[PDB]
Amino acid sequence: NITEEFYQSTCSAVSKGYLSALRTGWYTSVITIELSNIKEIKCNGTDAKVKLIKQELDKYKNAVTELQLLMQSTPATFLGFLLGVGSAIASGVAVSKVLHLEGEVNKIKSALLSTNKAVVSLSNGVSVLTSKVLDLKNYIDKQLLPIVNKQSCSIPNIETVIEFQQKNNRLLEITREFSVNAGVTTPVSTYMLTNSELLSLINDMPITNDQKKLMSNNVQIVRQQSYSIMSIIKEEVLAYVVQLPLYGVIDTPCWKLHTSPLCTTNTKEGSNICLTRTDRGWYCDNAGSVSFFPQAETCKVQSNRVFCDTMNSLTLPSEVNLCNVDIFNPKYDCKIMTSKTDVSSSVITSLGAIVSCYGKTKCTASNKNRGIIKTFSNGCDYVSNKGVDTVSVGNTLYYVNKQEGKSLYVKGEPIINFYDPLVFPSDEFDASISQVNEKINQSLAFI
Amino acid sequence: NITEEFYQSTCSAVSKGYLSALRTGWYTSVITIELSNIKEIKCNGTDAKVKLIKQELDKYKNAVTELQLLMQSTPATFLGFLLGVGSAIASGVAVSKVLHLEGEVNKIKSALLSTNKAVVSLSNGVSVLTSKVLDLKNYIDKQLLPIVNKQSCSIPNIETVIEFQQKNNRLLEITREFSVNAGVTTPVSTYMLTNSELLSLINDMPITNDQKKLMSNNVQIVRQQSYSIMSIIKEEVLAYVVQLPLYGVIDTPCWKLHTSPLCTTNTKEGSNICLTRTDRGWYCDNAGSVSFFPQAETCKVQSNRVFCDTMNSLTLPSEVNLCNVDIFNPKYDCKIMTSKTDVSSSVITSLGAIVSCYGKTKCTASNKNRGIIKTFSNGCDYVSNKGVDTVSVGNTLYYVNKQEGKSLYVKGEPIINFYDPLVFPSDEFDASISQVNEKINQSLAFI
Amino acid sequence: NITEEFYQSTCSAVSKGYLSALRTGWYTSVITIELSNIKEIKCNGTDAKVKLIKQELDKYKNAVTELQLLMQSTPATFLGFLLGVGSAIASGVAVSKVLHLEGEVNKIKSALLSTNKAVVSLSNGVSVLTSKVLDLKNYIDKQLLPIVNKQSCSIPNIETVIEFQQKNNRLLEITREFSVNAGVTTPVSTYMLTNSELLSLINDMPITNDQKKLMSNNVQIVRQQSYSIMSIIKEEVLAYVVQLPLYGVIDTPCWKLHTSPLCTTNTKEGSNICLTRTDRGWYCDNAGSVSFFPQAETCKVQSNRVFCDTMNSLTLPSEVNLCNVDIFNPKYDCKIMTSKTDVSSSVITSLGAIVSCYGKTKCTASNKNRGIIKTFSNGCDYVSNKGVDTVSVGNTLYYVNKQEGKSLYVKGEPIINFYDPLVFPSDEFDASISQVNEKINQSLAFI
Amino acid sequence: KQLLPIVNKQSCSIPNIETVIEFQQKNNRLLEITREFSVNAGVTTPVST
Ligand SMILES: [Cl-]
Ligand SMILES: [Cl-]
Ligand SMILES: [Cl-]
Ligand SMILES: [Cl-]
Ligand SMILES: [Cl-]
Ligand SMILES: [Cl-]
Ligand SMILES: [Cl-]
Ligand SMILES: [Cl-]
Ligand SMILES: [Cl-]
Ligand SMILES: [Cl-]
Ligand SMILES: [Cl-]
Ligand SMILES: [Cl-]
Ligand SMILES: [Cl-]
Numbered sequence A, B, C: 001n002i003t004e005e006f007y008q009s010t011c012s013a014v015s016k017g018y019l020s021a022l023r024t025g026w027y028t029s030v031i032t033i034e035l036s037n038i039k040e041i042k043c044n045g046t047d048a049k050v051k052l053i054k055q056e057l058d059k060y061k062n063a064v065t066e067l068q069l070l071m072q073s074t075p076a077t078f079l080g081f082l083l084g085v086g087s088a089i090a091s092g093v094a095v096s097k098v099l100h101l102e103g104e105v106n107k108i109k110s111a112l113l114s115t116n117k118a119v120v121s122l123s124n125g126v127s128v129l130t131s132k133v134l135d136l137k138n139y140i141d142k143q144l145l146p147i148v149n150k151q152s153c154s155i156p157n158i159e160t161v162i163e164f165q166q167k168n169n170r171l172l173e174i175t176r177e178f179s180v181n182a183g184v185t186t187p188v189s190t191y192m193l194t195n196s197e198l199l200s201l202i203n204d205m206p207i208t209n210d211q212k213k214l215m216s217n218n219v220q221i222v223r224q225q226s227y228s229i230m231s232i233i234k235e236e237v238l239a240y241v242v243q244l245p246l247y248g249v250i251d252t253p254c255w256k257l258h259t260s261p262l263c264t265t266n267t268k269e270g271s272n273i274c275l276t277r278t279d280r281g282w283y284c285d286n287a288g289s290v291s292f293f294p295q296a297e298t299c300k301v302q303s304n305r306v307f308c309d310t311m312n313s314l315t316l317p318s319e320v321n322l323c324n325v326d327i328f329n330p331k332y333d334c335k336i337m338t339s340k341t342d343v344s345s346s347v348i349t350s351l352g353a354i355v356s357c358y359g360k361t362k363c364t365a366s367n368k369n370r371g372i373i374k375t376f377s378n379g380c381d382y383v384s385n386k387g388v389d390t391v392s393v394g395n396t397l398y399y400v401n402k403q404e405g406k407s408l409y410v411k412g413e414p415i416i417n418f419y420d421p422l423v424f425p426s427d428e429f430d431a432s433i434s435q436v437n438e439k440i441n442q443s444l445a446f447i
Numbered sequence D: 001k002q003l004l005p006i007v008n009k010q011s012c013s014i015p016n017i018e019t020v021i022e023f024q025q026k027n028n029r030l031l032e033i034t035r036e037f038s039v040n041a042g043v044t045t046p047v048s049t
Helices: A048-070 A090-098 A104-111 A136-144 A158-180 A195-203 A209-216 A219-224 A318-325 A433-446 B048-070 B090-098 B104-111 B136-144 B158-180 B195-203 B209-216 B219-224 B318-325 B433-446 C048-070 C090-098 C104-111 C136-144 C158-180 C195-203 C209-216 C219-224 C318-325 C433-446 D017-039
Strands: A003-007 A012-034 A117-121 A127-135 A227-234 A237-259 A274-277 A281-286 A289-293 A300-302 A305-309 A314-316 A335-339 A345-348 A352-357 A363-367 A371-375 A379-384 A390-393 A396-399 A406-410 B003-007 B012-034 B117-121 B127-135 B227-234 B237-259 B274-277 B281-286 B289-293 B300-302 B305-309 B314-316 B335-339 B345-348 B352-357 B363-367 B371-375 B379-384 B390-393 B396-399 B406-410 C003-007 C012-034 C117-121 C127-135 C227-234 C237-259 C274-277 C281-286 C289-293 C300-302 C305-309 C314-316 C335-339 C345-348 C352-357 C363-367 C371-375 C379-384 C390-393 C396-399 C406-410
Touching (some): A003 A352, A012 A281, A012 C396, A048 A136, A048 C158, A104 A237, A127 A136, A127 A158, A127 A195, A136 A158, A158 A227, A158 A237, A158 B158, A158 C158, A158 C219, A195 B048, A209 A219, A219 A300, A219 B158, A281 A318, A289 A318, A345 A396, A352 A390, A396 B012, A396 B090, B012 B090, B012 B352, B048 B158, B104 B237, B127 B195, B136 B158, B158 B227, B158 B237, B158 C048, B158 C158, B195 B219, B219 B300, B237 B274, B281 B318, B289 B318, B335 B433, B345 B396, B352 B363, B379 B406, B396 C090, C003 C318, C012 C136, C012 C281, C048 C227, C090 C227, C090 C237, C104 C117, C127 C195, C158 C237, C195 C209, C195 C219, C219 C300, C281 C318, C345 C396, C352 C363, C352 C390, C379 C406
Parallel strands (some): A003 A406, B012 B127, C012 C127, C012 C305
Antiparallel strands (some): A012 A237, A227 A237, A274 A335, A345 A352, A352 A379, A363 A390, A390 A396, B003 B012, B012 B237, B227 B237, B237 B281, B289 B314, B345 B352, B352 B379, B363 B390, B390 B396, C117 C127, C227 C237, C237 C281, C281 C289, C289 C314, C300 C305, C363 C371, C390 C396
16 A cells, blocks of 8 residues: 655655566567568469569568668666666667577477477677567468469469468568667567567566566566667578566665755745755665666556666665654755745656745645645645646646545655855765754854 | 847847747547457468468457556656756556546446547546447457457458458557657657547547647647556457646737856956856746746747647746846846856857857858858857857857847946956856855955 | 777876768758548448548548648757757748749649659759658549549549558558647658658758768658748649758767766765766867757767757857867867756767766676676776676666777876865866866865 | 469369359350250261351
8 A cells, every 4th residue: 555754844845655576687589580581482473362462562671671781780778866877778688799609599480389488598608588470481482382383473462462461461560660760679578579489488487487477467567677779690590689678676675755945934035045955756666775766767657566677776775764764863964955936846756746936936735526625835845646636836737546445644844944044065966964053063163 | 920139238139029839738638449350360261362461360369468467567757956846647547547447447438439539527526528430359359259259260251361461560660669768658649549539539528629729729739747657458449548737828828038257358368257047948937926947948839839738837926037138137036057167168048149259169150151240259148049050169060040030239348347356256157146146255255 | 899998097088080970051942742632522321431531532632631721831940058059940930931822832833743753943043952751632533533523433443442541541640740749740650751862852952972981871750850840722632842961061079978977985975076967968169169958968979970950059160079089188268067966977989888886786797698797986987888788876777878889098196186165066967177266266266 | 374273282272263264165065065965865967166
């Protein structure tokens, strides 16, 4: 169950009750389409059905030529600025490089001779699940060869014409996608891997039962965190690498920290000072530490499960959580920014709304059946989503999340009142409680 | 008519003459597709036309299964950093939640029994326009039932095979979109809602005539500001919620503020100081105040109409406009940032170009038929788009907008000259005229 | 060959050996589809093949009506914040404006009467390559006119029904794309311009042989840097402007600068100070200066060729490169930011990994066949990709690029040790070596 | 040359509709000749077309 606490003292709110699903590594799979080698198409037939087959075959050939151009290129793609820099498809591309080595394709080819799904050991030693999802070589050779391997074509039935267009379409769409994404696509579409194929791939994957269940019940999220990397087209084989998320952390507690500016509320226009907790984002317990995702928009929430990517995280000591109940705690130096910009806004939380209302701004909360039920005064305040449908701050209407769950309003003195505006450092974008303190003392020592 | 004024004193320019179209709220509509309940497909027929029908029916069934997986998940998605945080589909999702309640679908179902368009009152009390855009239940039951509700299939004509593929295609594409977007799409495609259906929906909407006209003449913009939210598939009904923008503010004056760095131009390399107005973006008059959109890229301009979203705005007193004619005005504390980074660049405006030219940079403006017609000297300067096609600053060529309209060059002393570099605070990212002043005095008091 | 150097003194690394391909200008081409003027469709025939033709014709007519709505709207779309602001399709839109002038379409129309590819001089004087990619007027008039210009329809063969759907599909997809992108698309899809058409357009373009070769071997990148702009649909002609990149700078040296925070490593928690080189990004030699791209994600790397856009660059003196071998050099004031935020992270480079390891973070580098082979101690360090497959910093696993190439570890004293923490200005987001120095002296003078 | 592929193999390659019609046209003459011989005990007069 989702619960939420608002801290009046620091103009912030924490939503608890979420369970983690963190992408920690990558699985790489090789997806293959078996192609037919087609040179000239031998026919003088002006028959309309032969003509449609020949047009479809030209589309097929142009698709192959197009992909051949692509395989000749190396495929590539508050506190967010503190993040490191990864190379998201380095793992997929490494596998893709191996597929260009001599006889490497042959391994794949003979392995998928009897079945359409096999585990192949590549030359470098990595084992990859390999899958043949479409056999155009077989279709073309068994249904289309008679109609154009001979000058006097045996005219195909209308149903064959339609069927070939259906089969070839997937090749055209895959090529279509690779062509406007420079050989790397994300999310992985159902053309790259159908829902059936993906579920089957997940089920045949060397992963825990929890991971299989998690991935199977959230394939749409799996798709969004996956890449499809165009690799090789040679020796009647199209191969692309699909890079799937590995979720090495599952079902640990996660919570979302929401923060909003906290300013003094003097009537004197520019005499006010402001403070904002900068450590907003997603937090998940992880291996004795806390995975912190400063850009909460990089996580996807499904019911009460949070899908995040560790590439977009910092690893913090778990004491970082103490900033929520006691921003002045001695065990962790809580991060804040400062300013004199007392502009009004709202932060819509999981179960309510934080409202930073300053100056002459009209700030209210409304129910759909009654209109305004609360008018906010200046300062930072909060309303739960129970009985509330919208919040308005100035000319901005916000709808609140109608998710069920309890909110707790933790009363406390706004900590901004504890500071003397004459020595308050109001130009900090990346500071903390202690940095502001020692800076204040350096101003007082000068006095 | 669009007009534009350049203020030499502050290295900024305002483009006037625009009319507002601000998204202020949301309308939620329920779009339905009537589905056929198909279990086993009874036929031993190896007939090629029966085979194509059976393949199309499998695609249909897999689509339904796919969407069933999706409906089991809760759908979710300079001065920009001052903005609040909304929940963009909270309204749509709230309606989507109601559709999961018992007998709620039945209301929709019986309401659309006689017509394909109706207004339904949901259990919570909200009235939503409901629309049936495709009846696959009817097609399958009346055209396809005989061919597979019996072991000995009555073989369908070739035209039926083609027609079914045409009809079923929309279901497949809708599913396709939802599958790579985790059940929430934006913009709303013509698969979700055809141009005809959307116009019809707009026309049947409970909105003013001005709003209907505005939305109808700009449906492509409406699409981009809309969401489609996958909701339920049960009891032979596919339902998704389409969340349409409500434009509560129309035809008020808007203007675009462009700003560029203003630096001193001493020959001594690092002895220069810089100032940039930070309040660039779109401004629209709105309800006695001004809606300010700091990220001008969040607004879409169509001719002289500006489409913005209030979620990406601050609400400011109208005195903010005074900063354009008098940055030192006593009624509003104009926002600026400071630095010593005198790098060269250009800002292409609505009707010209601002050029910040410093150091050894070559800065020119050219006509296509003649080449260089103006060479800029160091400092901040401006050229109108009349007679000018391009501007070059260093190795960067900019094309100017060829929109028709008059520009006015307001001469004035660059305000950066009024500051003493020895006490100039050059580390402010979020300051103002008054903050820089009082900071300067605190440095002078120490002296 | 790609090589790489790590500077221990400044926690940064430069990857060399790349060749430039910088977009410097734009080429504008007019792409045309010849349309048929179809009013009423005259038939009482309930024949299933006539019915499918009539359904396809309605789709055709709705497409035309849809595009007519679109042509009635004016189409529009660390150190990154230092960049100027361009108008990316100003050139394309200017050409698009000309196409709305009287008789301008007629010029295009008669020019493409004998061939499907011609160079037309527009009224304003600009010469544009013009291309007819699809003739629906001819198909409809020669194949479909008999079946519905007469009440008693001559029933078309099944192959014609299929063929028309194939031909019309491209019109529907083009319209589809324009409809969800407000008349401006990027990348340019194969529906807008097939691979064959694009290559042909490139080959007929008034550009050097090097440019043709470069564009032809990298069409997928060309597509991504191109725009398609919906222009006019009148007098049986659909015309859209395709805006292609001109690469005015080719095969000049480029290098990628990677930077990571450098902090002191005292055991006393908040007693540490940090420094980060802010000038990371791509650098290319360009016309006697250096084109600097602060957002390295705006450049696309294909093997050892870097595709960048000068619109996202600053033009710097070539002395900026001196910051790599000597950050205290007297010829260029090297840019840095400061803080006390000693958080751990890694930067994956072209040929290795920079590791900023501070506090209690576990930082290691591993091989796939052996596990941990290096454990990092606190400070900033580096490992080459030779023999290394992954790096871990806290809970974040990074795969390293497996690109071949030599790395050089340049030993040096971390420059952060040269600063006294008691007077170290740790609040600079946009400073430099000299700015930090003079600021330190102003603190010492107060002492 | 036209009918062998469709039935010398268990999995028939399905013939186009035009072939079906054409074969009926060609075979018809054989059927009519047989028809005539069958009601005339192998001797016909006049000799038909
Ligand atoms: Cl979130
Ligand atoms: Cl909202
Ligand atoms: Cl709920
Ligand atoms: Cl201070
Ligand atoms: Cl804009
Ligand atoms: Cl440009
Ligand atoms: Cl104009
Ligand atoms: Cl100062
Ligand atoms: Cl890069
Ligand atoms: Cl990675
Ligand atoms: Cl390599
Ligand atoms: Cl200081
Ligand atoms: Cl047939």
